[PDB]
């Protein structure tokens, strides 16, 4: 109920969709002065400022990153590495964090909702949704996250389908 | 001592005459060597 409204209020201005002949196939992320955007989602950036840049690539981590200018670094998402197990907020409701794995109940999940960040009860991004795999009744996510050292860890289960 | 050309008779002074000039009655070699035994 109110969780989707809080997601729409937090991700209103900072989330920009990716257009491809009128089709919405992905979402970029503006956090820490960086613009995260995946490889398989191909299209034009809806924002005029973020589209006229050059994104350095990382095909192993599956991330394109760039440098957000200084006049927009205050209007970004927050990030942290301290995460316990339990529940977190996602755009279609809730997501479970168990044994270092993000799980989503079934019914939701198609092609197009790639790049949506995972939020917490405070308002900090803990993961970035990149792919998903159907596991019985409860699907698992293939995402990226950080740690205390500062190494971007990409978690990928078996036989995932890119969204 | 023989001559080089295969049909010659050799005088006393080394000069070689033709082989039929040896006993011919006409003096061919110096000191008449060819006409000594005919």
């Amino acid at each position: 109920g109110k969780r989707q409204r809080m997601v729409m209020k937090l991700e209103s201005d900072k989330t920009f969709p990716i257009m491809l002949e009128g089709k919405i196939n992905g979402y970029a992320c503006v956090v820490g002065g960086k613009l995260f955007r995946p490889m398989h989602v191909e299209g034009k950036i809806d924002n005029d400022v973020l589209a006229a840049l050059k994104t350095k690539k990382a095909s192993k981590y599956d991330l394109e990153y760039a440098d957000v200018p200084q006049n927009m670094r205050a209007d970004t998402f927050k990030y942290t590495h301290e995460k316990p197990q339990g529940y977190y907020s996602w755009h279609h409701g809730a997501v479970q964090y168990e044994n270092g794995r993000f799980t989503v109940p079934k019914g939701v999940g198609a092609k197009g909702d790639s790049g949506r960040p995972i939020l917490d009860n405070q308002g900090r991004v803990v993961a970035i949704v990149l792919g998903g795999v159907n596991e019985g009744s409860r699907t698992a996510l293939s995402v990226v996250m950080w740690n205390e050292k500062g190494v971007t860890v990409k978690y990928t289960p078996e036989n995932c389908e890119q969204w | 001592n023989e001559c080089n050309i295969p049909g010659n008779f050799m005088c006393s002074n080394g000069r070689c005459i033709p082989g039929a000039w040896q006993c011919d009655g006409l003096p061919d070699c110096f000191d008449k060597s060819d006409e000594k035994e005919c």
Binding site: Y65, W146, G150, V151, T152 | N8, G25
Partner: protein
């Protein structure tokens, strides 16, 4: 013994035959040349004529004379009034029977000539006379000195050997002079002690023979009605194409020829010695011939690559000598053999732009091949190591740049040039 081989040509004859050039036009010449065989080396030719040599006109064995027919009757002159020449004058050595031996330079023809009265006899036949040198050095007149090689010249003697020529009966020689006229008749007067046969065709057909009888014919009142031949029975002539042959197929015999070809020794010239200069796997030759001189070179390996060249002017002939041998023959000199050894330009013991040129002048192909493959191996190794270095630097810095904090730790900054 000497007569033992002269009496065989004592039983033949001389004769007359047709020549082409006999000092005015063509005529029947007593010195008609049958053949000129010139295969001896230092210029010795062996003619065969019609007139005979070394015999007396009556039939005895006179020393140096020539015995020629002259319109049926046989004459003689001393041999030192007979002269012949091919292009320059020749020198008669000796003669025996039909065969003269001479010494001649080269030419297109031979003209044998003499002069008995104030009437000059000649005969020119277009037979090539050639001068054949001995050895690998080509001269026209034999040298004053040199070395002696095996040569083959016509033997000056006259000994019985394998060769024979065949003498046959003469044919009926015709005689216009023998026929004559009475007041109104035709008289055939044979010569002294001589038979003849007469054939006339004025009335019927007449074939008659006389034996030393001056016969008057009553019919046939023209000279041209009668042909008077002459009969020869105790003599031979050579089996020539210039004489008619007698009836009956008897050849009656054959005689051996003088002056055959035998094995002798001839002095050959000797060339000036070359001036031999050496180079690295090379021998140069400065060659100054007197007369033209063959140069024969070959290698002492599996492929000889031989060379053969008649050199006549001063020449310089740079050759290549490998470590397997080389050999030249210059003139009548023996073969000189040469062998190369390992002297390459360069120092094999350091300064790496010198060892490359040493082992390149030593082995040209292997040095290029080895340096090419070593440079390719070194290039692939350096490029692959730099590729793996860039791969590991990307693999180090990829997790640390995707973080929004954008910091690099202390060790991985300087060691990977992260800044």
């Amino acid at each position: 013994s000497t007569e033992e081989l002269f009496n065989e040509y004592k039983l033949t004859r001389p004769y007359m035959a047709r020549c082409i050039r006999c000092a005015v036009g063509s005529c029947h010449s007593p010195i008609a040349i049958e053949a000129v065989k010139s295969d001896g080396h230092d210029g010795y030719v062996r003619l065969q004529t019609s007139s005979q040599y070394g015999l007396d006109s009556s039939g005895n064995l006179k020393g140096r004379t020539m015995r020629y027919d002259m319109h049926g009757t046989i004459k003689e002159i001393p041999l030192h009034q007979v002269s012949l020449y091919t292009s320059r004058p020749c020198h008669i050595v000796d003669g025996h029977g039909y065969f003269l031996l001479a010494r001649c330079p080269a030419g297109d023809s031979i003209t044998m000539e003499f002069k008995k009265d104030s009437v000059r006899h000649s005969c020119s036949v277009p037979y090539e006379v050639k001068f054949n040198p001995v050895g690998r050095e080509l001269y026209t007149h034999p040298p004053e000195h040199g070395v002696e090689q095996a040569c083959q010249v016509y033997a000056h003697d006259a000994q019985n050997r394998g060769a024979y020529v065949e003498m046959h009966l003469p044919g009926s020689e015709v005689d216009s002079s023998l026929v004559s006229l009475s007041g109104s008749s035709v008289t055939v007067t044979p010569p002294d002690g001589t038979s003849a046969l007469v054939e006339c065709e004025c009335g019927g057909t007449k074939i008659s023979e006389t034996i030393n009888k001056t016969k008057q014919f009553s019919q046939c009142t023209k000279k041209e009605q009668c042909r008077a031949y002459r009969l020869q029975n105790d003599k031979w002539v050579y089996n020539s194409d210039k004489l008619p042959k007698a009836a009956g197929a008897t050849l009656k015999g054959k005689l051996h020829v003088p002056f055959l070809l035998a094995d002798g020794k001839c002095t050959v010239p000797l060339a000036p010695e070359p001036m031999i200069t050496f180079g690295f796997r090379s021998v140069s030759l400065k060659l100054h011939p007197k007369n033209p001189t063959y140069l024969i070179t070959r290698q002492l390996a599996d492929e000889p690559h031989y060379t053969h060249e008649l050199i006549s002017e001063p020449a310089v002939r740079n050759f290549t000598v490998t470590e397997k041998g080389w050999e030249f023959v210059w003139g009548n000199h023996p073969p000189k053999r040469f062998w190369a050894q390992e002297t390459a330009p360069g120092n094999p013991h350091g300064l790496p732009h010198e060892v490359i040129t040493h082992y390149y002048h030593r082995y040209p192909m292997s040095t290029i091949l080895g340096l090419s493959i070593c440079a390719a191996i070194a290039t692939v190794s350096v490029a692959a190591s730099t590729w793996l270095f860039c791969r590991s630097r990307v693999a180090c810095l990829t997790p640390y740049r995707l973080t929004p904090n954008a910091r690099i730790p202390f060790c991985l900054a300087v060691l990977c040039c992260a800044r």
